[PDB]
């Protein structure tokens, strides 16, 4: 049983059942997160494009494949835990379990949380951002203690397809998760946010994730198939109708041309790694625009560069480059003592992460204070935006400004989490960086603005059907805006 659950648990993340995947991650994070393109003609009405249909924005509330899922299995891994007096299950539980529910706040805003029922019902009160990011860091403060107290313990290897049992590295990986949604919070509640960062890379309480070899990550995905890969793949040229050659670019999701225009000016050697040819000529990387009218796939739009992910890939949940981000960026911009100078953390990034991927040629790119990101010339010429996305170089200047120092960083964070959309959506909301290319073909009806782009989902459809009295009372007391895609959530409060 506890094995079983912790796996069901560990499918809440990420799903591993495509068409949630395709909505949470393929056309929810990762358009918004500045990675991917939707790319599928027909989508007249996208998350991307700011006129989304309810069944694609609900998903991260309304999916039973989420929370219903995750609450059911969270009570079975406590039964454990009660029937055998070993809090560890329970622990490493917790872990997963705000590893999957902040992305849904991270959407909406004010969620239900403290009251969601037993099998995962919502039709509750809704809690605060504000309260429910408290609670996660009571909830995980709870569980790196019980681990700490217990970190010679092990599960067996079957009950944890993420670490195989080994209690330190979810040390790790919740101090490092911890860290994220400290620095999430460094400006809605600096106080907080400082005690939190510090805490979690302070070496008295484990340790946060410094090595590839520790990252999390998932890959039993129970389907045998990377569901990322499933669904960007969805209606891919077929090869009899690409005159004789496979097609290898994908169908319904493209690589955007946000990431490609910063990568190819900085001359990155992480290309081949991310992403597939164009068979645009002359041109090996060109992506597709985020918020355009989609072309035709058949036409051009199986022309540009596609995610290069296989059906074995896993999913990710955090890497050790975010880790080093984050205490970058924390020493540089917020002055949180974070155990070393936000340079080294900078530089250990970007090593981490090609380290990662298998690329050559870190110590030319660490060193390069010259090259920069492009701007977007659509080859197919309908969608070009002229101007150079940032004038931001690589190599660490220690003598820059704050601004420019965040800016740099999360340049960085943002091309070595390649894939975590929902991540690169949050740092985006947080801080204003990447600066991305800003949206042409605005839906939103004059709701959404173009450069800021999509701020959070709007409350699902069904909770003023279901759930009345208490959405109601959210948008009136929590959310301090309309039920749109404008609002800010509670931690988008940079000025
Ligand atoms: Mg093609």
């Known amino acids: 049983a506890l094995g079983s659950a912790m796996n069901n648990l560990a499918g809440c993340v990420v799903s591993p059942d495509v068409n949630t995947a395709q909505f949470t991650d393929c056309l929810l994070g990762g358009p918004l997160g500045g990675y991917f393109a939707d790319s599928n003609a027909g989508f007249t009405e996208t998350i991307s494009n700011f006129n989304p249909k309810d069944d694609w924005s609900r998903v991260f509330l309304k999916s039973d494949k989420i929370i219903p899922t995750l609450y059911s299995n969270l009570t079975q891994v406590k039964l454990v835990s009660q ?15 705000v590893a999957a529910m902040h992305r849904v706040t991270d959407a909406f805003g004010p969620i239900p949380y403290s009251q969601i ?13 504000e309260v429910t990011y408290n609670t996660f860091f009571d909830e995980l403060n709870a569980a790196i203690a019980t681990l700490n107290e217990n970190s010679n313990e092990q599960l067996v290897p079957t009950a944890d397809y993420i670490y195989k049992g080994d209690v330190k590295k979810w040390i790790r990986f ?17 106080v907080k946010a ?14 946060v994730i410094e090595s590839n070899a520790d990252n999390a990550t998932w890959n039993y995905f129970e389907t045998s198939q990377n569901p990322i890969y499933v669904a960007t793949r969805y209606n891919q040229v077929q090869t009899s109708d690409h005159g004789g050659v496979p097609c290898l670019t994908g169908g319904d999701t493209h690589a955007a041309a946000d990431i490609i225009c910063y990568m190819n000016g900085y001359k990155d050697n992480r290309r081949e790694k991310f992403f597939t040819k164009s068979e645009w000529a002359g041109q090996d990387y060109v992506g597709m625009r985020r918020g355009i ?9 199986h022309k540009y560069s596609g995610v290069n992910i296989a059906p074995t890939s896993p999913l990710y949940w955090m890497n050790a480059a975010e880790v080093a981000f984050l205490r970058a960026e924390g020493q540089a911009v917020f002055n949180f003592s974070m155990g070393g100078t936000a340079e080294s953390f900078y ?8 380290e990662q991927w298998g690329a050559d040629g870190v110590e030319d790119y660490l060193k390069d204070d010259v090259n920069k990101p492009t701007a977007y010339t659509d080859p197919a010429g309908t969608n070009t935006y002229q101007n150079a996305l940032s004038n931001i170089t690589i190599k660490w200047n220690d003598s820059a400004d704050k601004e420019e120092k965040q800016e740099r960083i999360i340049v960085q964070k943002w091309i070595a989490n390649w894939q975590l959309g929902n991540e ?23 709701v959404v603005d173009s450069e800021k782009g999509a701020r959070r989902m709007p409350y699902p459809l069904d909770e003023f059907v279901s759930n009345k009295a208490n959405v109601e009372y959210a948008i009136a007391n929590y959310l301090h805006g309309a039920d749109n895609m404008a609002t800010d959530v509670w931690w988008a409060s940079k000025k």
């Open 347 to 354: 530089n250990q990034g970007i090593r981490l992460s090609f």
């Open 174 to 190: 919740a101090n490092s998760l911890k860290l994220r949604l400290a620095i999430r919070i460094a400006y809605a509640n600096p």
């Open 117 to 129: 029922g037993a099998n995962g019902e919502i039709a509750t009160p809704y809690d605060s951002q």
């Open 83 to 97: 029937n055998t007096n070993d809090p560890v299950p329970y622990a490493i539980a917790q872990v997963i379990k």
């Open 424 to 446: 690169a959506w949050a740092d985006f909301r947080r801080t204003g960086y990447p600066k991305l290319i800003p949206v042409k073909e605005n839906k939103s009806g004059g």
């Open 293 to 301: 009218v989609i072309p035709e796939l058949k036409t051009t739009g």
């Open 194 to 207: 400082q005690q939190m960062a510090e805490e979690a890379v302070n070496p008295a309480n484990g340790g």
